[model samples]
Target: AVLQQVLERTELNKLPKSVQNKLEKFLADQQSEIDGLKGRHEKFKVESEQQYMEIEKRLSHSQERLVNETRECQSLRLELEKLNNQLKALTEKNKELEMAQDRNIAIQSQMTRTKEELEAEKRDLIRTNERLSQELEYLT
Candidate 1:
């Protein structure tokens, strides 16, 4: 009986040691896995931050472009308004000249007036056309 007790106690002790070793190995494996996960998380975080910065940079550039386009649109609108006003004034002048020509029906004087008026109108039209072309080019 005494020998049997000694053997049983030794066996029990060995069993605990074996279990302890297995537990230690499990803990080590878990720790290694955690470390690997940590490394991956850090890498992902850096990549995400870089992507965010790139997106922000692109957004900023787009905003700046939009502002520039808006300003250009406003300038074009103002220029178009000025041109419209000039055209309106020219039309009024044309009406006045027509009335004057009608009042002076002397053939020679009428011919001279008509020629002068037509030349002036042609020059004004050419200038207006040139300005329109310039505006179109700028818009494009």
Candidate 2:
């Protein structure tokens, strides 16, 4: 804004001839360099704005991905917990079956012991009967 006013205010003729010649030569080369700097500045502004927009988009995508991953992780955890519960229930069932089988074996062993005791008692009674019969024959 002020650069235009300054240019309008300052005249080349109002200054000394020597100063004008030197100033003209120096500014003549700087004219191209100044325009080059201005172009670069404008390019930097446009690129910076685009970079900001790209970073914002990347941040949004990253947030969305994080949300999806968290949801998936929670689902996996719930499934694993459910599987663990089922395994625990299966273990209880297996233990009950084993206990019932053990009870059956114990009852069968007790019955075998009782049968042996009864057979032994019957044999002893038969031997006593034969001894009594021999004694009666002698008495007669």
Best by lDDT: 2
C-alpha RMSD (angstroms) for model 1: 25.0
**RMSD, one per candidate, in order:** 25.0, 5.9
- Model 1 lDDT per residue over 1-140, tens place: 12233356666466565675676677778878999999999999999999999999999999999999999999999999999999999999999999887777677787899999999999999999999999999989
**Candidate-wise lDDT, in order:** 0.86, 0.87
Worst 10 residues of 2 by lDDT: 1-10
Clash statistics: count for each candidate: 0, 0
lDDT of 2 at 112: 96
What lDDT is obtained when candidate 1 is compared to the true structure?
Answer: 0.86
Count clashing pairs, candidate 1.
0
Tell me the RMSD of model 2 versus the true structure. Answer: 5.9
Kindly list the per-residue Cα lDDT of model 2 for residues 1-140, writing each as its tens digit. 22333455466347676866676666767887999999999999999999999999999999999999999999999999999999999999999999998999999999999999999999899999999999889999
Query: Model 2: which residue pairs collide?
Result: none
